[PDB]
Nucleic acid binder design. Structure first.
Ligand SMILES: Nc1ncnc2c1ncn2[C@@H]1O[C@H](COP(=O)(O)OP(=O)(O)O)[C@@H](O)[C@H]1O
Ligand code: BEF
Ligand SMILES: [Mg+2]
Lengths: 93, 80, 107, 95, 504, 107, 93, 88, 98
DNA sequence: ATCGGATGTATATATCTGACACGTGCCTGGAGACTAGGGAGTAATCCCCTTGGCGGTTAAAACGCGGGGGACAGCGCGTACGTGCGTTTAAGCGGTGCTAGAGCTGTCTACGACCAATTGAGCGGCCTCGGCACCGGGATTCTCGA
DNA sequence: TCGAGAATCCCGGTGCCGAGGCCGCTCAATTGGTCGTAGACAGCTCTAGCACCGCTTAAACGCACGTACGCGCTGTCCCCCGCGTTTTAACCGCCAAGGGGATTACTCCCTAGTCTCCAGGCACGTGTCAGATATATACATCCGAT
């Protein structure tokens, strides 16, 4: 019985940032739990943003507002920059 | 524009007298204005975020209630 | 025709299709728009890159080459913004920042 | 005259008996609008929004002063000082 | 390695062609190269360098061992217990000392309670041998490794089951001629920690010694047999599928005759009733006795789950306490001094008989041995022997090392007035020598009969001159009748096969 | 046939169909069992009965015959378990319990 | 444009408990907000109870478990009793 | 004799030993401890364990199991606003 | 005359030692018996996993370490160096856990 | 301590008055009846992983002891804050007026759900070597009597 | 008073087991269609939020002064720390049994969806009394004189 995770993607990002540093198994489990946690937070805030305005569709704009509600300080600015760059690249391709 | 001085000394002493404070020093006032300004900055930041998301220009009562629920200080009494 | 993954279209590294599936079957809203999972995967990739970069520098500060959870604990609690974000989270096998109070030191 | 510490207790009984607000309206409204200038220019407030902010701010400061009073009694004093407020915000996690 | 592989096949291919059927049955390296080459192409006088005399069957037992060394293969000295397997092992080492003239690095391994018994009989028989008993703490083992082990100033090292794990790194560094393992029951598992360490040392031969073969399964014996000669077998599923567990599908029992034929040039086992050496057999009873009136309530306070508000997660174990003694449940014991009177035998079932039995035996001049499975039960018997004022010694798990040695010789003292002798099962009765007693009682049973069979023959061995009367105690209509009947099911599946290999 | 509400046939006072609609149109789960809104409506009616009874007693103590939020504040903060439930809730126009510390009183 | 609330139902429960007591409008709004808050708490807890066990249906079992998770101590026992009484009367009818 | 009934005296809250509480206080940064911290710390720890094990037993009973797994404890800790990373 | 230290040096050395390392600080079997004794009151005949007990032990040690940090801040605020039971009562009163 | 002596607090009486309780007309959301299909309840089976207890080693807890460093109580002192009186000033109330923007309705239309055929990205399983964990020796650092 | 014993850090050697990397399988992602509909957008209405003005008066500001509490300093005393020695139970390995978690197959019944109908609930007028408020009066309440 299979059981999915985020391990190989975290490992790819690790090989982009530090080309030589490895990672343990327990730290991989910690990063997996971190990604699931931040996913649940942003999805919950986007869901009840869509519920407050009596819309029915989670677009990218509710995700942008959920990021600007959750992440503090410069993380919000850099995350909004990265997300807008990603969607702008995706639409033209 | 020095509107923080509108939170005067007798208002802070009335808020302390409701709390149970018998005797107050003289340096409480600047610290209390700082605490109040930080708290208002956080709540109004979240409320203006909600209002800009709704594509309006008017801060309703519901946005303040949602911001206070977002930070953990739930408010009963102003609709919903 | 020839298939191509949406993560390669967005240039990301996290999977877009798995995020789209977890938003459709997560019961967050009725209909999920097409631009949402790309944006959400980009934000998750950014946060993962931040924590792994700080943990890599903290691992290099001890001449280690593999990231043990103590390194993640140091990299989170030494940062200010990641501490404000992960303020309630207990990391298992973490430990405490080395912090002795000032008056307990001998004269 | 009265002795010091009598009118204070009578005001404690008075302001814990009552229910109304304690900060005047227009200075608080000017303060809220000045803080809102930094985020989006030319906003517009409903009245019950400002009333909600004033009610929550009074509840916050009353809770803070109760915890400050507990800390100041713990240090064997009766007079609150700014280091008491700094401790009370240090314990709650507002650092 | 490769010359001896042919030298192993000098005698294996001298047997039947089942070895050809086994080497070519892989699912195979260059063993097939040296297989097809050969496929196409003493000392019977009881030698008196020992101090004493041998036995005429033991001379045959010695000559089987030098035959294994002459053919350069391993083996198992699986003779029945009490027949003197130590004398055959020591004189085999003195064979290499005085005939082959090689005093080498020898390493024997025993249980902890039997470590002095080796070094006594080495000094009794071959006093020219430098031997240890590697005891002690981390501080005391620090010298003996540094002083005399690293200096190569020894002949025989007598270690134990746990010290061989704690000190594996100063023992890989020394090559060995033999690894002689007494009580081959710890190696019944293949994934155990002790078996994983023994397969890393360097040895010429390995005289594995046991009093009993396999206990439960066919899966147990090959795991012993795997670490005999791993160059030859090296198989887990293939040997299980070759024999298929005593014809569990067809019920033929003609595939079993090859299995007796594999082991007959590969093992030595001789029967105590075959070669007498005491000229007197043993008797046995099973005193099926009923529950006392107090614990009838306690048997009701368990199954209906009424004493109360505690864990009962293993009812097989919780009932097994009440079948033995009521005072283990913390609340059967009434008082604030917890009392002291004749109430103790009055409340227990087996103590009613045992109080009567010992008074029948204290008059007759008998000396009994009391065994158990639970350590905490022997504490109750200790206060009972103080109540009747009987002399004893109590050997248990985690008493001491040197306190065990004193208590054996106090009970094996001539004209010693110690009457009972409390032992456990997994720690006391696994190789000690207690010829000074005559009758043996088991207070309870065990999930392995060969554990209790290891303990019954304790006093029935060479040197005993009385009639051994074993008295098992079984609680009537209880879990012990189910356990003893389940254990008997394990016995007939084994011994009715081990009856056939010695005969054919 | 003759119509009959579910709130009548279950023996309640809160509505049941409204709670059923709020469970379906709130995206809590995909399918909603037919015994869930009866149970939930009974729970909400019980909690409302508790708070209205305590607030009625608090209003009867001050010799008033209508309920102001001061009475709700007193009725919540005097109970143990209701204070445990509404522990991080500001009731508007509420006020504070009368409480003076012991060492501040004159001696 | 209408806006629904719980006003008349709180008024009915008040007339059952205290037959001679009215209620002001601000207290009515506070009771309305209380009912909505407790409804959202119980519904969200039961929703992720159904998600944690890979089910797809909120039964009465999940509502009972969510009530036993949220309500502290003596309120939980009486709440479970009232709910079981209501569902038992509803099923036989 | 009378050795058969000499050890029933655990009281498992006393199993949290005095040097264990001192090791926790040394990690917490506490220089020098009074002699009455121990009973209070045992009481605090017992109340915390009662809350978390109550919620984990409730999550275990709802799934009709008899085995308190790790995800039940992680859900119970997330329920009280104390998130635990590293167990799923 | 042997080499005794002044009272307080070994304490600071232990503070550095235990703030450097990350192992568990309560022995496993007494904590497991404690968990089972508390769990007997809610449902009889439970059966824990090993990782559940590890999770409870990690959470409990983190809770108590954070508690002793706040207790140290209170006792330093009262111009002492000794934590006392009223310090723990204060630090749990401010957090809102009474 | 008590006794008058101001003094703030509570009480009884009388009088408006606007928020509340109550009756009506309408309309949309809840109830009844019916049908389809897929979650889930149950039976049966396998095997992992939990429990209990013993053996043996050894590291940690318990206990007693000396002694010094911090807790605590008391004394004094000095300055900061409560209290009250008189002056200023800005909050509050009402009143009018303007209009910007919330809020509703109608009308397309791009877009996300749904579904069938196809296939490679990701996952479990299995080797394998190198980074981390000791191990012992040697140099350096730190605290405590000098 | 600088030296002296103990702890810490570092360097080189060894070894070992867990992360890194291939490999075969397969199921969930992708692509290509169809279609109903949520949302975007334009337009109209009407209401509440802004801005200003004038009058009143309650509250904030400023000042003096007296006292009582914060703070530092001393002395005593006793409680916790350091340390050595003896006991005891934790830790790991081993050995049994078996209970219960996890899976699969099959049938069935419970809920989503649809249509029809109809009454409960809501917005809208309207009387009317609970409570706010003034006004006189009784009573605890702190405090100086003695
Ligand atoms: N030749 C012999 N003469 C006298 N006693 C002997 C002889 N051989 C063996 N024994 C007895 O055997 C006992 C030890 O035998 P042991 O090695 O324990 O047999 P096993 O190992 O089969 O039980 C010793 O007490 C010794 O007296
Ligand atoms: F191994 Be023998 F029975 F001493
Ligand atoms: Mg022997």
């Amino acid at each position: 019985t299979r059981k999915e995770s985020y391990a190989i993607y975290v490992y790819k990002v690790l090989k982009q940032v530090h080309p030589d540093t490895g990672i343990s198994s327990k730290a991989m489990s910690i990063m997996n739990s971190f990604v699931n946690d931040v996913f649940e937070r942003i999805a919950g805030e986007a869901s009840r943003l869509a519920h407050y305005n009596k819309r029915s569709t989670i677009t990218s704009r509710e995700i942008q507002t959920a990021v600007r509600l959750l992440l503090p300080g410069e993380l919000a600015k850099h995350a909004v920059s990265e997300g807008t760059k990603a969607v702008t690249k995706y639409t033209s391709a | 524009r020095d509107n923080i001085q509108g939170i005067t000394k007798p208002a802070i002493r009335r808020l302390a007298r409701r709390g149970g404070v018998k005797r107050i020093s003289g340096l409480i006032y600047e610290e209390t204005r700082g605490v109040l300004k930080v708290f208002l900055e956080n709540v109004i930041r979240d409320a203006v975020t909600y209002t800009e998301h709704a594509k309006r220009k008017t801060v309703t009562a519901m946005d303040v209630v949602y911001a206070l629920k977002r930070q953990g200080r739930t408010l009963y009494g102003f609709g919903g | 025709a020839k298939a191509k993954t949406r993560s390669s279209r967005a240039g990301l590294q996290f999977p877009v299709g798995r995020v789209h599936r977890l938003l459709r079957k997560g019961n967050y809203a009725e209909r999920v728009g097409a631009g949402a999972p790309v944006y959400l995967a980009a934000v998750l990739e950014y946060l993962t890159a931040e924590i792994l970069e700080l943990a890599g520098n903290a691992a290099r500060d001890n001449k280690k080459t593999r990231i043990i959870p103590r390194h993640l604990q140091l990299a989170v609690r030494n940062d200010e913004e990641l501490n404000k974000l992960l303020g309630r989270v207990t990391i298992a096998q973490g430990g405490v920042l080395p912090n002795i109070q000032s008056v307990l030191l001998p004269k | 005259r009265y002795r010091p510490g009598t009118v204070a207790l009578r005001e404690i009984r008075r302001y814990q008996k009552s229910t109304e607000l304690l900060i005047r309206k227009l200075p608080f409204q000017r303060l809220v609008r000045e803080i809102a200038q930094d985020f989006k220019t030319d906003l517009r407030f409903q009245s019950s929004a400002v009333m909600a902010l004033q009610e929550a701010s009074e509840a916050y400061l009353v809770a803070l002063f109760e915890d400050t009073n507990l800390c100041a009694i713990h240090a064997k004093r009766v007079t609150i000082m700014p280091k008491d407020i700094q401790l009370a915000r240090r314990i709650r996690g507002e650092r | 390695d490769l010359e001896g592989t042919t030298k192993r096949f000098e005698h294996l291919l001298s047997l039947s062609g089942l070895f050809k059927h086994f080497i070519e049955s892989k699912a195979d390296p260059k063993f097939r190269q040296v297989l097809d080459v050969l496929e196409e192409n003493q000392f019977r006088e009881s030698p008196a360098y020992v101090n004493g005399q041998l036995r005429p069957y033991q001379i045959q037992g010695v000559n089987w061992l030098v035959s294994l060394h002459k053919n350069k293969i391993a083996g198992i000295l699986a003779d029945e217990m009490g027949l003197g397997k130590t004398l055959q092992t020591i004189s085999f080492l003195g064979y290499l000392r005085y005939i082959e003239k090689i005093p080498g690095p020898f390493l024997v391994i025993a249980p902890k309670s039997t470590l002095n018994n080796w070094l006594r009989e080495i000094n009794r028989w071959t006093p020219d041998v430098n031997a240890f008993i590697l005891q002690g703490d981390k501080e005391e083992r620090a010298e003996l490794i540094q002083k005399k082990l690293l200096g190569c100033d020894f002949d025989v090292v007598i270690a134990s089951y746990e010290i061989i794990i704690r000190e594996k790194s100063p023992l890989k560094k020394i090559n060995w001629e033999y690894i002689i393992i007494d009580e081959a029951h710890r190696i019944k598992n293949e994934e155990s920690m002790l078996s994983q360490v023994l397969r890393e040392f360097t040895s010429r031969n390995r005289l594995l010694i046991t009093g009993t073969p396999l206990q439960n399964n066919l899966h147990e014996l090959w795991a012993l047999l795997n670490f005999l000669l791993p160059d030859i077998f090296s198989d887990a599923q293939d040997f299980d599928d070759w024999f298929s567990s005593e014809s569990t599908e067809e019920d033929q029992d003609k595939i079993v005759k090859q299995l007796h034929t594999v082991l007959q040039p590969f093992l030595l086992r001789r029967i105590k009733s075959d070669v007498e050496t005491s000229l007197l057999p043993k008797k046995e009873l099973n005193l099926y006795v009923g529950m006392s009136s107090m614990q009838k309530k306690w048997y009701k306070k368990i199954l209906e789950k009424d004493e109360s508000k505690t864990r009962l997660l293993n009812i097989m174990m919780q009932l097994r306490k009440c079948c033995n003694h009521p005072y283990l449940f913390d609340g059967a014991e009434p008082g604030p001094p917890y009392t002291t009177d004749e109430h103790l035998v009055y409340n227990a079932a087996k103590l009613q008989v045992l109080d009567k039995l010992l008074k029948k035996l204290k008059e007759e001049g008998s000396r009994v041995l009391i065994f158990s499975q639970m350590s905490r039960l022997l504490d109750i018997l200790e206060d009972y022997c103080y109540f009747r004022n009987y002399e004893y010694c109590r050997i248990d798990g985690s008493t001491a090392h040197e306190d065990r040695i004193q208590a054996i010789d106090d009970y094996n003292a001539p004209d010693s007035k110690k009457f009972v002798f409390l032992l456990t099962t997994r720690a006391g009765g696994l190789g000690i020598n207690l010829t000074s007693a005559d009758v043996v009682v088991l207070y309870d049973s065990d999930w392995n009969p060969q554990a209790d069979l290891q303990a019954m023959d304790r006093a029935h061995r060479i040197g005993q001159k009385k009639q051994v009367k074993v008295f098992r105690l079984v609680t009537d209509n209880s879990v012990e009748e189910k356990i003893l009947e389940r254990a008997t099911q394990k016995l007939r599946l084994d011994q009715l096969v081990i009856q056939q290999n010695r005969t054919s």
